[model samples]
Target: PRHGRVITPESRAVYLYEAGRLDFGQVNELEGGKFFPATQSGLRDPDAPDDVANGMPPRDGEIASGGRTADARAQLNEPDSVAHWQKHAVRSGQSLQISWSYSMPHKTRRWTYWITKPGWDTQARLARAHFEPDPLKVYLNTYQPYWGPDADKELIPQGETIHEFNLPTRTGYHVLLAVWDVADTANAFYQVIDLNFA
Candidate 1:
């Protein structure tokens, strides 16, 4: 790896030699652990306490700042940076297939799926009751305050699962998938992928 200037094992040895403890001729000898004038020059003077000849003193300064600054900037500039969503169009009477796959760095426990027809007005009670046991809720037309329409079946599995839904009609719709940590509601990730049926 380049570090500002060329730095290799050979260069490092040359640097040690310049500090007066190493001899150019003793390169092989040093490798062999044999004593030579070049290698002996940099030896600490036992009689002289605190004498340092070859390498620089151990670094004691602080390390540079980390990604915290960048994260803060993103939170201010792009609140939705962490979530990814996509959209697709569908035609009437054609089957539209929607599929998604994702892996989490940490373990997840629950998943949710919410689907809604576009431009349809929905109420909070309708949304909440729409997908009974489904952890995910879909919002249609207006962004209803609560989840809508109950789900008839579970479409996804716990942790690191793939999900697919087939639309039987040629109507436009939206699908939302979310992975959640049952123990901690805040720990979750979601992705949205739309499908078009023609």
Candidate 2:
């Protein structure tokens, strides 16, 4: 996988990785594990102009997979309210640090973050409607044309990278979606984070 998963505020996939049920490399993709293939010419990211609403996002209930359809990977999309999952605790508007552990970084377009709206259904499967329309933060990069594979290796991050943002004001439980958009490929990585607010 030419991407990575969120390490801090640990993503859903990280729990499975710790259980010896997933590969360390595949954890980066989480079948949200490989990448999301852009469905149309204007829909593909890193190539197409960037727009949260216009971009191709995975189908509702399939957002966790990056729209992939692996039986095992489907578990990540579950919205089980009673399931025991790890959650990060922070005060509303608190400064937060999120870290990424990369298997192999690709030419990156931007890392965009989305959060669930207040009063979202915790028992319903995750969908685009569950999130705010725009990203809470977008770490945008200067547009770089896709060079042949290996040509843009110099532009990628290595191993681990960290980014900080102020958490939005929200109460109770919420989910955060972090996307790693690739500049040279027609795919992106998705990571979902569970959080509890003070």
Candidate 3:
């Protein structure tokens, strides 16, 4: 079983937060939310909500800002340190599953997911240019704008499900991007899960 807080689909920790809120300012620079650590380097930040670290979908009301606004915010999440890394190494074998809980709990016809592009140049900063564009897989949907491949897997959001194709072929570090296009609300939850492979 996964042991680290970030090993699971969502980080099990939440710390120093605005009591369930986050904000991010923009440009070629960056900022928030009740995020789980999702750090790119495996380091933890004291300011993070016990586990809350911090994603996409034009972030609701910011649509006028253009299609890639959410993508840009992702690159600069606090403590991502150019990227986030998880404690439990991503397993090479299948065993990929995802579960979720919520303060804004709800239902949807679909949820989305993505994996970093195979040839991503992690040698540098995490850029929008690094992923594939279409989702690698998901609980549901076709992803685009600034994501990766459609893993083509499905996850049932009745709290949990398995993503069979999640078997990571990449043997190093990688990021899994999750998008929950909340069915009822006008927003979607964006997330980046960090992991290392065996």
The candidate that wins on TM-score is: 2
List runs of model 1 lying over 4 Å from the truth.
1-86, 89-104, 121-160, 168-170, 173-185
Models 1 onward score TM values of 0.30, 0.82, 0.50
lDDT of 2 by residue, 47-163 (tens): 334322224557778887676656456667777565555677778989888888776677677778889999998778887677888779888666445453553554578657688
TM-score ranking from best candidate downward: 2, 3, 1
Counting clashing residue pairs in each candidate, in order, gives 21, 3, 32
Candidate 2, which segments miss by more than 4 Å at Cα?
A: 31-41, 44-56, 148-154
* All candidates in order of lDDT, best leading: 2, 3, 1
What value does the lDDT take at residue 121 in candidate 2? 83
Position 129, candidate 1: lDDT:
24
Total backbone clashes of candidate 3, pairs 3 or more residues apart or in separate chains: 32
TM-score of 3: 0.50
Could you tell me the C-alpha RMSD of candidate 1 in Å?
28.3
What lDDT does each candidate get?
Answer: 0.25, 0.69, 0.39
> Cα miss at 99, model 3 (Å)?
1.0
For candidate 2, give the lDDT of residue 136. Answer: 93
